[PDB]
Design a protein around this ligand. Structure first.
Ligand SMILES: C[C@@H](CCO)[C@@H]1NC(=O)[C@H](CC(C)(C)O)NC1=O
Ligand SMILES: O=C(O)CCC(=O)C(=O)O
Ligand SMILES: [Fe+3]
Length: 294
């Protein structure tokens, strides 16, 4: 099975098959053509952030193990996992200017703009009235949301799963990758997904699934994982722009569900939801999934 694919053209997702969008929201995953988007700075960071900083050209992209939660905020910065191959760097948008080199800041901003264009184009196809969009998606459309550029370095010397089964937490994720390894759950079976040059992989997160579950057009967020990587040639990396609701509780009170004819119902505390699913992603015998309520 091949995922649907689209081009973003003036706020409109044009899929390359008549059933493309229908398949995308059933599959939880689809491809989108990259606009003119230089990826060199992110690729450099993805190959260097975990290395010790040494004098030279690579130095500004190295040594980021020094950026931990105490210098940023909870859930931010560098993490080495015990029972996953990934070592990771998470960074929310409010820290990008302080922490990222200039070229990576600019790439992050361009990926953020593109990701929100993708989100608006998806919402435009759903039975969700525009007057509710800003509140319903956690104020991320008015630039008060939670935007991470997050990097995965798959340490092939670690004998463990590559990245545990999980759902992403938020609205859309725009994923930059080069190699096989991603598998998505489809009709009860694990489907390998390979990246495509000049394209990003897009997927929906839990917030999208919760918002639309009881609407006329429900959208799936689907479980996915990365296979254990074995040694030999460059380590696998990936990185992605994750779009999430605001984490400030006076800006966004949590995750909503839309009930047509009634309005938005506040279903879940988002920070609690996020803290739980994040922790469960990286333990030995749990998974990054959630139990649907009601
Ligand atoms: C909100 C933020 C996570 C918390 O900081 C964001 N959401 C996600 O779902 C993933 C988490 C992952 C699957 C990599 O564990 N990545 C992110 O950057
Ligand atoms: O590395 C990949 O292909 C997937 C990464 C992923 O799912 C994530 O970071 O949430
Ligand atoms: Fe993911």
């Amino acid at each position: 099975y091949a995922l649907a694919s689209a081009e973003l053209i003036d706020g409109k997702l044009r899929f390359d098959s008549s059933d493309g969008f229908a398949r995308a929201i059933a599959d939880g995953f689809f491809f989108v053509k990259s606009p003119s988007l230089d990826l060199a700075a992110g690729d450099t960071f993805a190959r260097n952030f975990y290395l010790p900083r040494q004098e030279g050209l690579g130095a500004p992209y190295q040594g980021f193990s020094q950026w931990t939660e105490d210098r940023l905020a909870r859930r931010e910065g560098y993490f080495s996992r015990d029972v996953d191959q990934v070592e990771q760097f998470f960074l929310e948008s409010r820290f990008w200017q302080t922490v990222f080199p200039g070229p990576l800041l600019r790439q992050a901003e361009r990926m953020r703009s593109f990701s929100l264009e993708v989100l608006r184009a998806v919402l435009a196809e759903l039975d969700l009235p525009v007057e509710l969009w800003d509140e319903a998606t956690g104020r991320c459309l008015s630039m008060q949301g939670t935007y991470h550029l997050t990097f995965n370095h798959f340490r092939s010397h670690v004998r463990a799963r590559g990245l545990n089964v999980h759902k992403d937490s938020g609205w859309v994720t725009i994923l930059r990758s080069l190699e096989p390894g991603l598998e998505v759950l489809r009709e009860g079976d694990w489907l390998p997904v390979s990246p495509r040059p000049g394209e990003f992989i897009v997927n929906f997160g839990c917030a999208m699934e919760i918002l639309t579950r009881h609407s006329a057009t429900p959208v799936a967020a689907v479980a996915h994982r990365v296979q254990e990587q074995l040694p030999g040639q460059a380590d696998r990396f990936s990185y992605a722009l994750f779009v999430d609701s605001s984490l400030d509780p006076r800006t966004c009170p949590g995750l909503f569900r839309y009930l047509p004819g009634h309005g938005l119902v506040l279903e879940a505390d988002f920070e609690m939801f996020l803290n739980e699913i994040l922790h469960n992603t990286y333990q030995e015998n749990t998974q990054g999934l959630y139990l649907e309520h009601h």
